[model samples]
Target: TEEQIAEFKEAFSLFDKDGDGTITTKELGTVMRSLGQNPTEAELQDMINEVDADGNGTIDFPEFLTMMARKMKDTDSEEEIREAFRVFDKDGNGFISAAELRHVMTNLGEKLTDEEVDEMIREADIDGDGQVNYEEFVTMM
Candidate 1:
């Protein structure tokens, strides 16, 4: 409910460097380190402009959260896809072959036929290498 503001408040405090309602870059480096991101000096060089949508030399509060949300969505999707792909990747083989997909497909109590699953694999194996690699599998889902 209203407690959602706690999350915003916490991050706001973390980023605000809060003088004049704008964030300073030095603390951006600190926040990264505190979060255990382990960035090198070059990567830590500039962050403010990336969030400064209007090119105003500052990030508005709502813009800050919106930008952070978009970044989170990018990462959240890939991690989730990896987790789902693990169900078919089985041995951590990093790729999904026909048998792996077939086995997991039926094993899940779904009644799909092997032929149907092979057709699925055909479209999923984008490079036509006869198998679905992680990225191809990402496209599958």
Candidate 2:
């Protein structure tokens, strides 16, 4: 995978623009939108905050690696998804309720109405339990 990592480095460099060994938040949003995904400024900020281990506003090589690894594939195990699910499982229950979903989604700065959240739950709740469990979350992601 070294070759693949090298290729990613090349891609990152192209996006870096300033060659400052870091990609600014603006650069990240520009590239995402270019790729046809319209991420809000708050969404971008949340993303940077998630991967910006050093707390810097920019994404360096290491943080870029973490982001790429997380995004490059969808084979995340149940354990991995469970860990992520816990963040939105405010009540520590095994399922994520509509309110929890709203809190997490809005906390990330993505606006969504109650109806939209219910729609999302309906789409992902394969078991029809009125909430999202780890399995549903994994599939949804």
Candidate 3:
């Protein structure tokens, strides 16, 4: 549960519009624009309804939770493994590469144990894209 809290912490922010710690329908449009999908004015409404979960709550906190629920599968933590997903894949390319994870372990230097780095780096060895594959990364969580 404690680790679960850490995972959601970063997730809360991208949607935390304006850095004011408030996320709203207006902000959702801009946020996606900031990310990708250079949404059309027509697409703008599409953006909100895409994540919208309540009667015009327009992605209120509760709706945000529900939206995430819809986006990431439960228990399997489809989005939660996002730790399995984004924790290391910082660039959003999806899939952590050997170099990147090594950089983390190397730069963080004992901030993470060599054993973990060793195993995962090995796991990452398979992909020529130089990626770190996590058959076990999410296992820790």
Candidate 4:
């Protein structure tokens, strides 16, 4: 994990195009676009606010490390978890049915009895909608 953090510091240096020891908004915007995200100006502001620890309007290595650590601690980013959810949500309805969850679990080599599936779905279905929606799945994760 320390090695991973070291690699991230190197990556952060690459992102800091101006060699200023921090990533400016312009650099962040460029990288976000390069990553196929057309974040709105307000969204960009939100991103900086979320990670700028010193209120400097830029992300230094420490701030970047903090942000990366938080995400890494989750083990999967939102996009990664969402992609996994899609695999178990067979109907493409933006929700995972109990049956579908059971099927996915069994296929993954962990069989779940009907009662186990029911109990699991009940715990995950935060909206009481009888299915695990994206929000519910994200929260469950």
**lDDT of each candidate versus the true structure:** 0.75, 0.85, 0.60, 0.88
> What is model 3's C-alpha RMSD?
10.8
Candidate 4 lDDT, 35-121, residue by residue in tens: 998988788878888999989788889899988888776776767888999999988889899899999889999899989999989
Report clashes for each candidate as comma-separated counts.
0, 0, 8, 0
Residue pairs whose backbone atoms clash in candidate 2: none
- Across 1-141, the per-residue lDDT of candidate 3 in tens digits comes to 556445565576777765664466567677777787576666766766776655574555555665665554675665567654565765667667555666655665535555665566565455444455454445444
Judging by lDDT against the true structure, name the best candidate.
Answer: 4
The candidate that achieves the highest TM-score relative to the unseen native structure: 1
Write candidate 1's Cα lDDT for 1-141 as tens digits: 356556865677777764455665666777787888766655654567777777766666777777767877898888988898899887778888878887887889876777887888899888999878888987767
- Return the TM-score for each candidate structure: 0.70, 0.47, 0.40, 0.56
Candidate 3 lDDT trough over 10 residues, lowest sum: 127-136
> Where in model 3 is the C-alpha error above 4 Å?
1-6, 19-22, 74-141
True-structure RMSD for candidate 2: 14.5
Candidate 2 displacement at residue 132 in angstroms: 17
**Model 3, 98: alpha-carbon shift in Å?**
36
Each prediction's Cα RMSD? Answer: 3.7, 14.5, 10.8, 5.1
